[PDB]
Amino acid sequence: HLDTALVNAGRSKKYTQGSVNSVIQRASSLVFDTVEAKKHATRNRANGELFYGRRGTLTHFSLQEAMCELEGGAGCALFPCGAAAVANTILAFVEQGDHVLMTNTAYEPSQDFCTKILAKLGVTTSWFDPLIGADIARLVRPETRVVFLESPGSITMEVHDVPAIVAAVRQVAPEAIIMIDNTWAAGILFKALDFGIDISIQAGTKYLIGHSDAMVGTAVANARCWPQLRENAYLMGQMLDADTAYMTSRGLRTLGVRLRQHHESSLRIAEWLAQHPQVARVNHPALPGSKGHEFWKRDFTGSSGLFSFVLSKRLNDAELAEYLDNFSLFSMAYSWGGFESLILANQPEQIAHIRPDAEVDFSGTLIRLHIGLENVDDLQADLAAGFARIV
Amino acid sequence: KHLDTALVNAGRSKKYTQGSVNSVIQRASSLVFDTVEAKKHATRNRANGELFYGRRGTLTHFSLQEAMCELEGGAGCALFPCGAAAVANTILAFVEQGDHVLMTNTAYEPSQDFCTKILAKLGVTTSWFDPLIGADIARLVRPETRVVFLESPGSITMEVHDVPAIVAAVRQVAPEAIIMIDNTWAAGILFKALDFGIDISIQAGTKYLIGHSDAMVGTAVANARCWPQLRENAYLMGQMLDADTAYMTSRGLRTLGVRLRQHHESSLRIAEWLAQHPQVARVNHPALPGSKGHEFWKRDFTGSSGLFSFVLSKRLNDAELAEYLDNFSLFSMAYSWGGFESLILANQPEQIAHIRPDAEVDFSGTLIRLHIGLENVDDLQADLAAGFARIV
Ligand SMILES: [Cl-]
Ligand SMILES: [Cl-]
Ligand SMILES: [Cl-]
Ligand SMILES: [Cl-]
């Protein structure tokens, strides 16, 4: 069962050496006792033998083993943050002339990587609606090489129909590299590699770490794509420091108890918001009526704590400040996936600007919440006080 | 005023240290905005030293960036998870499809491999030059040459560029070229690259900045002209350094003086002895007279580090290689360098020839690269002497 796997994944004796957790091996240089030992390490430098710190130490090997088991992949590449994982995993599979097909609900830095970096390297990008399902077939070009998913979407939380998207992509381009940003699910609430996706990318920064105090990107690839991902990310010098690798493994151990609380609390708050006269719409994958909710219920095994809702009106700048500045428990900050609750606002035109090939369908101010581990009645009380300030 | 005082103090402003000697370690992704106005101010200054997002940095990163900018005389310092990431992403930040990169053929092998295995498929071509080409590099600059990549001394074989001659030649034919250098051997301070008209000085902080072989970090200090593009394009690739390693890099600066002076004295003494040794055909140490580009090192550097190489009087067969390398008492076989301990590695001539693109090597003996650590220099010499005894 998954809770037993979260506790045990990666904690083999060769990495833990008697402690419960892996050792922390801090290292650039790794010492070869003999020429024959150096030859053996050289041959196995991509297969978990100590060779060089850029390839990893015992601590990295342990985390890689854990992520491969939890996400069901053949290998796991480590990056200094989620944006690095997205950028470098896409880059590992394109050449000049290739085309990228990305959901227009992709995390904004992911879009910006395509339009600002890939574009000047001769790699084009086009977009698709997250609910496009099987109609994505007509958007696959002869030169399309990567299809990039993100389910639920960033900020607006639309859930893909991945079985329909994958089936349609494979009909037109069987050898396409299908990737997903699986951060919201922490890679475990949606088993992407079981759905025909080639690579599952996460900002471990969010729920894997779970305490908002470390940054880490991971990419777990199937056997078909792992050697190319591994070697091309390595050619860009991509790695994670040993101590953060340790903290990522450590975060796995409480991921189950944390996510169950994030799910329980955020769904309760979402249900209350959906009955609220000052709320026009609630974008929570687990709430019935939300875009792609039926796909979430069929394809996911749980929910995390991040969602959004649209207010009944567009706040003016004075109301936005009166609303946001005076919360007692919710804090304004970027990122999410930690133990504390956060709030951020976007006006409709701010979302429209980052929805290429699409138009927004709401006019109220959008509020994105991360529901942390605080008492749910206290968080509700905080939100209710905010509603009172803008009524 | 002097460098040792700067190494002790660089980056240790009270806003970062907050009462302790060293900067605080601020571990964060989320950084909290008290008000909408505060978020607006942070957003405007997210590339200007104001707390905004962990990917941009915390106080710990700002402290290190301030120190690197001061020590290397730059306008900004980008941070990367290792030196190879700094090289790959600093080159990538300036190239576009159709561009050409002109790189010394003595570049660090992973830097070459990035050019030929990543850049090539992105429509960016790379060609090479001999490290001693000097002013004759002009004829190699193409209309599409965007980056000129130096590494002085070179990897393994330690040839020192004539940077003034190279830079003047490039500027004459392509003044808008981005001139970069991998300045790792100098720890960015023994050769003040940005004072020589180089645009960006890159370092594997992994080596002498960290100084204990237990953290990986890359840095790239850019001049005012190139800093905004380096910064924003490295950021779009998600390049950053964890807060704790940033702290350890700043911490390493504090002993960088006493360490480098010991590495210099010990390695030059060993090089001088190797140069008199009948079992040694050539000593590649930038500080040793007669070494390739030594006169440029003496004119343009202010010190030496502890990494160098020498060529044996013969090519060792595989049995001799094991007998030699396996039985050292103090020197250890490992990659990397710049730590407190001494290391040894061997390369056959054809191995080096393979990583000298469009070029041949000019020696036939087995090449031995040494990093001279902080051990007693007489002990290290005796260890080498015992090694010579095994292959005589
Ligand atoms: Cl195909
Ligand atoms: Cl965010
Ligand atoms: Cl020019
Ligand atoms: Cl090395």
CSV table of N, CA and C in Angstrom, one decimal, chain A residues 26-35 38 51-54 80-81 83-84 87-88 91-92 94-96 107 109 112-113 116-117 120-123 205-206 212-215 232 235-239 241 244 320-321 324-325 331-336 340 342 344-345, chain B residues 27-36 39 52-55 81-82 84-85 88-89 92-93 95-97 108 110 113-114 117-118 120-124 206-207 213-216 233 236-240 242 245 321-322 325-326 332-337 341 343 345:
chain,number,residue,atom,x,y,z
A,26,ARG,N,28.2,14.2,1.3
A,26,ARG,CA,28.5,15.5,0.6
A,26,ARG,C,29.8,15.3,-0.2
A,27,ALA,N,29.8,15.5,-1.5
A,27,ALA,CA,30.9,15.1,-2.3
A,27,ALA,C,30.9,15.7,-3.7
A,28,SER,N,32.1,16.2,-4.1
A,28,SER,CA,32.4,16.3,-5.5
A,28,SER,C,33.3,15.1,-5.8
A,29,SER,N,34.5,15.1,-5.3
A,29,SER,CA,35.4,14.0,-5.5
A,29,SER,C,34.9,12.7,-4.9
A,30,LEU,N,34.9,11.6,-5.6
A,30,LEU,CA,34.7,10.3,-5.1
A,30,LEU,C,35.9,9.4,-5.4
A,31,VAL,N,36.4,8.8,-4.4
A,31,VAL,CA,37.8,8.2,-4.4
A,31,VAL,C,37.7,6.8,-5.0
A,32,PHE,N,38.6,6.5,-5.9
A,32,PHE,CA,38.8,5.2,-6.5
A,32,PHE,C,40.1,4.6,-5.8
A,33,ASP,N,40.0,3.4,-5.3
A,33,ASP,CA,41.1,2.8,-4.6
A,33,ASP,C,42.2,2.3,-5.6
A,34,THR,N,41.7,1.8,-6.7
A,34,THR,CA,42.6,1.3,-7.7
A,34,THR,C,42.1,1.7,-9.1
A,35,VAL,N,43.0,1.5,-10.1
A,35,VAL,CA,42.7,1.7,-11.5
A,35,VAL,C,41.5,0.8,-11.9
A,38,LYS,N,38.4,2.4,-10.5
A,38,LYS,CA,38.0,3.6,-11.3
A,38,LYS,C,37.3,3.2,-12.6
A,51,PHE,N,30.8,7.7,-8.6
A,51,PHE,CA,31.8,8.1,-9.7
A,51,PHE,C,32.2,9.6,-9.6
A,52,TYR,N,31.2,10.4,-9.5
A,52,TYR,CA,31.4,11.9,-9.4
A,52,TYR,C,30.2,12.5,-8.8
A,53,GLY,N,30.4,13.6,-8.0
A,53,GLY,CA,29.3,14.2,-7.3
A,53,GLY,C,28.3,14.8,-8.2
A,54,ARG,N,28.6,15.2,-9.4
A,54,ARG,CA,27.6,15.7,-10.4
A,54,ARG,C,26.7,14.5,-10.8
A,80,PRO,N,17.7,21.5,-9.6
A,80,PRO,CA,17.7,22.4,-8.4
A,80,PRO,C,16.4,23.1,-8.1
A,81,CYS,N,15.5,23.1,-9.1
A,81,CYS,CA,14.1,23.5,-8.8
A,81,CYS,C,13.2,22.9,-9.8
A,83,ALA,N,11.2,24.6,-12.0
A,83,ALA,CA,11.4,25.3,-13.3
A,83,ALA,C,12.6,24.7,-14.1
A,84,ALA,N,13.7,24.4,-13.4
A,84,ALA,CA,14.8,23.7,-14.0
A,84,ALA,C,14.4,22.4,-14.6
A,87,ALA,N,12.2,23.0,-17.8
A,87,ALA,CA,13.0,23.6,-18.9
A,87,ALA,C,13.9,22.5,-19.5
A,88,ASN,N,14.7,21.8,-18.6
A,88,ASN,CA,15.7,20.9,-19.0
A,88,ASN,C,15.2,19.6,-19.5
A,91,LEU,N,14.0,20.5,-23.0
A,91,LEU,CA,15.2,20.7,-23.8
A,91,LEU,C,15.9,19.4,-24.2
A,92,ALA,N,15.8,18.4,-23.3
A,92,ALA,CA,16.5,17.1,-23.5
A,92,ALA,C,15.9,16.4,-24.7
A,94,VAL,N,14.3,18.0,-27.7
A,94,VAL,CA,14.1,18.8,-28.9
A,94,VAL,C,15.4,19.1,-29.6
A,95,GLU,N,15.2,19.4,-30.9
A,95,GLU,CA,16.3,19.9,-31.7
A,95,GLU,C,15.7,21.0,-32.6
A,96,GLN,N,16.5,21.8,-33.2
A,96,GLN,CA,16.0,22.8,-34.1
A,96,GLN,C,15.1,22.3,-35.1
A,107,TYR,N,1.9,26.3,-16.2
A,107,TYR,CA,2.7,27.2,-15.3
A,107,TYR,C,3.4,28.3,-16.1
A,109,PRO,N,6.2,30.2,-16.0
A,109,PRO,CA,7.6,30.0,-16.3
A,109,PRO,C,7.8,28.9,-17.3
A,112,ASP,N,7.0,30.6,-20.6
A,112,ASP,CA,8.0,31.6,-20.9
A,112,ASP,C,9.3,30.9,-21.4
A,113,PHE,N,9.6,29.7,-20.8
A,113,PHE,CA,10.7,28.9,-21.3
A,113,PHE,C,10.6,28.6,-22.8
A,116,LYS,N,10.5,32.2,-24.9
A,116,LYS,CA,11.7,33.0,-24.8
A,116,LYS,C,13.0,32.3,-25.0
A,117,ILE,N,13.1,31.0,-24.7
A,117,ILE,CA,14.3,30.2,-24.9
A,117,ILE,C,14.2,29.3,-26.1
A,120,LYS,N,14.1,31.0,-29.8
A,120,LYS,CA,15.3,31.5,-30.4
A,120,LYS,C,16.3,30.4,-30.8
A,121,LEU,N,16.0,29.2,-30.3
A,121,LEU,CA,16.8,28.0,-30.7
A,121,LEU,C,16.1,27.2,-31.8
A,122,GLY,N,15.2,27.8,-32.5
A,122,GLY,CA,14.5,27.1,-33.6
A,122,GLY,C,13.5,26.1,-33.2
A,123,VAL,N,13.0,26.1,-32.0
A,123,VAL,CA,12.0,25.2,-31.6
A,123,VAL,C,10.7,26.0,-31.4
A,205,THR,N,9.7,21.2,-4.7
A,205,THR,CA,9.5,22.4,-3.9
A,205,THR,C,8.2,22.5,-3.2
A,206,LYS,N,7.2,21.9,-3.8
A,206,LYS,CA,5.8,22.0,-3.3
A,206,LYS,C,5.7,20.8,-2.3
A,212,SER,N,8.1,24.4,2.5
A,212,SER,CA,8.4,25.7,1.9
A,212,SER,C,9.8,26.2,2.2
A,213,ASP,N,10.8,25.3,2.4
A,213,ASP,CA,12.1,25.7,2.8
A,213,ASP,C,13.2,25.0,2.0
A,214,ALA,N,12.9,24.4,0.8
A,214,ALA,CA,13.9,23.8,-0.1
A,214,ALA,C,13.3,23.8,-1.5
A,215,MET,N,14.1,23.9,-2.5
A,215,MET,CA,13.7,23.8,-3.8
A,215,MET,C,14.4,22.6,-4.5
A,232,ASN,N,21.1,14.0,-21.3
A,232,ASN,CA,21.0,15.4,-21.8
A,232,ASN,C,20.9,16.4,-20.6
A,235,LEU,N,24.3,16.8,-19.3
A,235,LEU,CA,25.1,17.6,-20.2
A,235,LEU,C,24.9,19.1,-19.9
A,236,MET,N,23.8,19.4,-19.4
A,236,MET,CA,23.5,20.8,-18.9
A,236,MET,C,23.9,21.0,-17.5
A,237,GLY,N,24.6,20.1,-16.9
A,237,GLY,CA,25.0,20.2,-15.5
A,237,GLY,C,23.9,20.1,-14.5
A,238,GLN,N,22.8,19.5,-14.8
A,238,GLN,CA,21.7,19.6,-13.9
A,238,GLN,C,21.8,18.5,-12.7
A,239,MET,N,21.7,19.0,-11.5
A,239,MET,CA,21.8,18.1,-10.3
A,239,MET,C,21.1,18.8,-9.2
A,241,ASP,N,21.7,19.3,-4.8
A,241,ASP,CA,22.6,19.1,-3.8
A,241,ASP,C,22.2,18.0,-2.8
A,244,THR,N,19.6,18.7,0.1
A,244,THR,CA,18.2,18.8,-0.4
A,244,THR,C,17.7,17.5,-0.9
A,320,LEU,N,-9.0,45.2,-3.3
A,320,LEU,CA,-8.0,44.2,-3.3
A,320,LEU,C,-7.0,44.3,-2.1
A,321,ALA,N,-6.6,45.5,-1.8
A,321,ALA,CA,-5.7,45.7,-0.7
A,321,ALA,C,-6.4,45.5,0.7
A,324,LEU,N,-6.8,41.5,0.9
A,324,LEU,CA,-5.6,40.7,1.0
A,324,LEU,C,-4.7,41.1,2.2
A,325,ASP,N,-4.7,42.4,2.5
A,325,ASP,CA,-3.7,42.9,3.5
A,325,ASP,C,-4.1,42.5,4.9
A,331,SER,N,-1.4,33.9,4.2
A,331,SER,CA,-0.4,34.8,3.9
A,331,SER,C,-0.3,35.0,2.4
A,332,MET,N,0.2,36.1,1.9
A,332,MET,CA,0.5,36.3,0.5
A,332,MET,C,1.9,35.9,0.2
A,333,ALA,N,2.0,34.9,-0.7
A,333,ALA,CA,3.3,34.5,-1.2
A,333,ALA,C,3.1,33.6,-2.4
A,334,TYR,N,4.2,33.5,-3.2
A,334,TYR,CA,4.2,32.5,-4.3
A,334,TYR,C,4.6,31.1,-3.7
A,335,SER,N,4.6,30.1,-4.6
A,335,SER,CA,4.7,28.7,-4.2
A,335,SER,C,3.6,28.2,-3.3
A,336,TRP,N,3.6,27.0,-2.9
A,336,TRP,CA,2.5,26.3,-2.2
A,336,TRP,C,3.0,24.9,-1.8
A,340,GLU,N,1.6,25.7,5.6
A,340,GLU,CA,0.8,26.9,6.0
A,340,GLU,C,-0.1,27.4,4.8
A,342,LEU,N,-1.9,29.9,2.1
A,342,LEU,CA,-1.5,31.1,1.3
A,342,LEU,C,-2.7,31.5,0.4
A,344,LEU,N,-3.4,34.3,-3.1
A,344,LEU,CA,-3.0,35.1,-4.1
A,344,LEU,C,-4.1,35.5,-5.0
A,345,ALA,N,-4.1,36.7,-5.5
A,345,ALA,CA,-5.2,37.2,-6.4
A,345,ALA,C,-4.7,37.5,-7.8
B,27,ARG,N,16.4,29.5,4.4
B,27,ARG,CA,15.9,28.5,3.5
B,27,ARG,C,14.4,28.8,3.1
B,28,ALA,N,14.2,29.0,1.8
B,28,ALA,CA,12.8,29.4,1.4
B,28,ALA,C,12.6,29.1,0.0
B,29,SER,N,11.3,28.7,-0.3
B,29,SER,CA,10.7,28.9,-1.6
B,29,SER,C,9.8,30.2,-1.5
B,30,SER,N,8.7,30.0,-0.8
B,30,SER,CA,7.8,31.1,-0.5
B,30,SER,C,8.5,32.2,0.3
B,31,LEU,N,8.3,33.4,-0.2
B,31,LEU,CA,8.7,34.6,0.6
B,31,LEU,C,7.5,35.5,0.8
B,32,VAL,N,7.2,35.9,2.0
B,32,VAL,CA,5.9,36.4,2.4
B,32,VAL,C,5.8,37.9,2.1
B,33,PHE,N,4.7,38.4,1.5
B,33,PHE,CA,4.5,39.8,1.3
B,33,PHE,C,3.4,40.2,2.3
B,34,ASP,N,3.8,41.2,3.2
B,34,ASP,CA,2.8,41.6,4.2
B,34,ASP,C,1.6,42.3,3.6
B,35,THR,N,1.8,43.0,2.5
B,35,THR,CA,0.7,43.8,1.9
B,35,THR,C,0.8,43.7,0.4
B,36,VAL,N,-0.3,44.1,-0.3
B,36,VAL,CA,-0.3,44.2,-1.7
B,36,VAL,C,0.8,45.2,-2.2
B,39,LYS,N,4.1,43.5,-2.0
B,39,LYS,CA,4.3,42.5,-3.1
B,39,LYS,C,4.6,43.3,-4.4
B,52,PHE,N,11.7,38.0,-3.0
B,52,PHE,CA,10.5,37.9,-3.9
B,52,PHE,C,10.2,36.4,-4.1
B,53,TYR,N,11.1,35.6,-4.4
B,53,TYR,CA,10.9,34.2,-4.6
B,53,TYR,C,12.2,33.4,-4.4
B,54,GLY,N,12.1,32.2,-3.8
B,54,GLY,CA,13.3,31.4,-3.5
B,54,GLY,C,14.1,31.2,-4.8
B,55,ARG,N,13.5,31.0,-5.9
B,55,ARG,CA,14.2,30.8,-7.1
B,55,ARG,C,15.1,32.0,-7.5
B,81,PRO,N,23.9,25.1,-9.9
B,81,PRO,CA,24.1,23.9,-9.0
B,81,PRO,C,25.5,23.3,-9.2
B,82,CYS,N,26.2,23.6,-10.2
B,82,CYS,CA,27.6,23.2,-10.3
B,82,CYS,C,28.2,24.0,-11.4
B,84,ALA,N,29.6,22.9,-14.2
B,84,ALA,CA,29.1,22.5,-15.6
B,84,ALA,C,27.8,23.1,-15.9
B,85,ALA,N,26.9,23.3,-14.9
B,85,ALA,CA,25.7,24.0,-15.2
B,85,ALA,C,25.9,25.5,-15.5
B,88,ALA,N,27.4,25.6,-19.2
B,88,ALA,CA,26.3,25.3,-20.2
B,88,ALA,C,25.3,26.4,-20.3
B,89,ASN,N,24.8,26.9,-19.1
B,89,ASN,CA,23.8,27.8,-19.1
B,89,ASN,C,24.2,29.3,-19.4
B,92,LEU,N,24.5,29.1,-23.1
B,92,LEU,CA,23.1,29.1,-23.7
B,92,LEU,C,22.4,30.5,-23.6
B,93,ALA,N,22.7,31.2,-22.5
B,93,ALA,CA,22.0,32.5,-22.3
B,93,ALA,C,22.3,33.5,-23.4
B,95,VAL,N,23.4,32.5,-26.9
B,95,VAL,CA,23.4,31.9,-28.2
B,95,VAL,C,22.0,31.8,-28.8
B,96,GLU,N,21.8,31.8,-30.1
B,96,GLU,CA,20.6,31.6,-30.8
B,96,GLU,C,20.9,30.8,-32.0
B,97,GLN,N,19.9,30.1,-32.6
B,97,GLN,CA,20.1,29.3,-33.8
B,97,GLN,C,20.8,30.1,-34.8
B,108,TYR,N,37.6,22.3,-20.7
B,108,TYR,CA,37.1,21.3,-19.9
B,108,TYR,C,36.2,20.4,-20.8
B,110,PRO,N,33.6,18.3,-20.4
B,110,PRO,CA,32.1,18.5,-20.4
B,110,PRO,C,31.6,19.8,-21.0
B,113,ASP,N,31.6,18.9,-24.6
B,113,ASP,CA,30.5,18.0,-24.9
B,113,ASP,C,29.2,18.7,-25.0
B,114,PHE,N,29.0,19.7,-24.1
B,114,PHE,CA,27.8,20.6,-24.2
B,114,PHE,C,27.7,21.2,-25.5
B,117,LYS,N,27.2,18.2,-28.3
B,117,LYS,CA,26.0,17.3,-28.1
B,117,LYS,C,24.7,18.0,-27.8
B,118,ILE,N,24.8,19.3,-27.3
B,118,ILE,CA,23.6,20.0,-27.0
B,118,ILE,C,23.4,21.2,-28.0
B,120,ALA,N,24.9,21.9,-30.9
B,120,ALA,CA,24.9,21.5,-32.3
B,120,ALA,C,23.5,21.2,-32.7
B,121,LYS,N,22.7,20.5,-32.0
B,121,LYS,CA,21.4,20.1,-32.4
B,121,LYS,C,20.4,21.3,-32.3
B,122,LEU,N,20.8,22.4,-31.7
B,122,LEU,CA,20.0,23.6,-31.6
B,122,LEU,C,20.4,24.6,-32.7
B,123,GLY,N,21.2,24.2,-33.7
B,123,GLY,CA,21.6,25.1,-34.7
B,123,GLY,C,22.7,26.1,-34.3
B,124,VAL,N,23.5,25.8,-33.2
B,124,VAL,CA,24.6,26.6,-32.8
B,124,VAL,C,25.9,25.8,-33.1
B,206,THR,N,32.8,24.6,-6.8
B,206,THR,CA,33.2,23.2,-6.4
B,206,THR,C,34.6,23.0,-6.1
B,207,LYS,N,35.5,23.7,-6.8
B,207,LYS,CA,36.9,23.5,-6.6
B,207,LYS,C,37.4,24.4,-5.5
B,213,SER,N,36.0,19.8,-1.1
B,213,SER,CA,35.5,18.7,-1.9
B,213,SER,C,34.2,18.1,-1.5
B,214,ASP,N,33.3,19.0,-0.9
B,214,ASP,CA,32.1,18.4,-0.3
B,214,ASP,C,30.8,19.3,-0.7
B,215,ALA,N,30.9,20.1,-1.7
B,215,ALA,CA,29.8,20.8,-2.2
B,215,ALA,C,30.0,21.1,-3.6
B,216,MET,N,28.9,21.3,-4.4
B,216,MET,CA,29.0,21.7,-5.8
B,216,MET,C,28.3,23.0,-6.0
B,233,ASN,N,18.1,35.0,-18.6
B,233,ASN,CA,18.1,33.7,-19.3
B,233,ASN,C,18.5,32.5,-18.5
B,236,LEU,N,15.3,31.7,-16.7
B,236,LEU,CA,14.3,31.0,-17.4
B,236,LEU,C,14.7,29.5,-17.6
B,237,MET,N,15.9,29.1,-17.4
B,237,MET,CA,16.3,27.7,-17.3
B,237,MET,C,16.2,27.2,-15.9
B,238,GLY,N,15.7,28.0,-15.0
B,238,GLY,CA,15.6,27.6,-13.6
B,238,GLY,C,16.8,27.4,-12.8
B,239,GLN,N,17.9,28.1,-13.3
B,239,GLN,CA,19.2,27.9,-12.6
B,239,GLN,C,19.3,28.6,-11.3
B,240,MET,N,19.7,27.9,-10.3
B,240,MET,CA,19.8,28.5,-8.9
B,240,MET,C,20.7,27.6,-8.1
B,242,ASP,N,21.2,26.2,-4.0
B,242,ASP,CA,20.5,26.0,-2.7
B,242,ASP,C,21.1,27.0,-1.7
B,245,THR,N,24.3,25.7,0.3
B,245,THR,CA,25.6,25.7,-0.4
B,245,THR,C,26.0,27.1,-0.7
B,321,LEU,N,50.7,1.2,-15.0
B,321,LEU,CA,49.7,2.2,-14.6
B,321,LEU,C,49.1,1.8,-13.2
B,322,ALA,N,48.7,0.5,-13.1
B,322,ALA,CA,48.2,0.1,-11.8
B,322,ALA,C,49.2,0.1,-10.7
B,325,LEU,N,49.7,3.9,-9.9
B,325,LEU,CA,48.6,4.7,-9.3
B,325,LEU,C,48.0,4.0,-8.0
B,326,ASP,N,47.9,2.6,-8.1
B,326,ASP,CA,47.2,1.9,-7.0
B,326,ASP,C,47.9,2.0,-5.6
B,332,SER,N,45.4,10.5,-3.8
B,332,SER,CA,44.3,9.6,-4.1
B,332,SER,C,43.8,9.8,-5.5
B,333,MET,N,43.2,8.8,-6.1
B,333,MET,CA,42.6,8.9,-7.4
B,333,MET,C,41.1,9.3,-7.3
B,334,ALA,N,40.8,10.5,-7.8
B,334,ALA,CA,39.4,11.0,-7.9
B,334,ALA,C,39.3,12.1,-8.9
B,335,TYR,N,38.1,12.4,-9.4
B,335,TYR,CA,37.9,13.5,-10.2
B,335,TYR,C,37.7,14.8,-9.3
B,336,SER,N,37.6,15.9,-9.9
B,336,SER,CA,37.6,17.2,-9.2
B,336,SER,C,39.0,17.5,-8.6
B,337,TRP,N,39.1,18.7,-7.9
B,337,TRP,CA,40.3,19.2,-7.3
B,337,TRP,C,39.9,20.4,-6.5
B,341,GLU,N,43.0,18.0,0.1
B,341,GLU,CA,43.8,16.8,0.0
B,341,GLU,C,44.3,16.7,-1.5
B,343,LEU,N,45.4,14.9,-5.0
B,343,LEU,CA,44.8,13.9,-5.9
B,343,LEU,C,45.8,13.6,-7.1
B,345,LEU,N,45.7,11.7,-11.2
B,345,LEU,CA,45.0,11.1,-12.3
B,345,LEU,C,46.0,10.9,-13.5
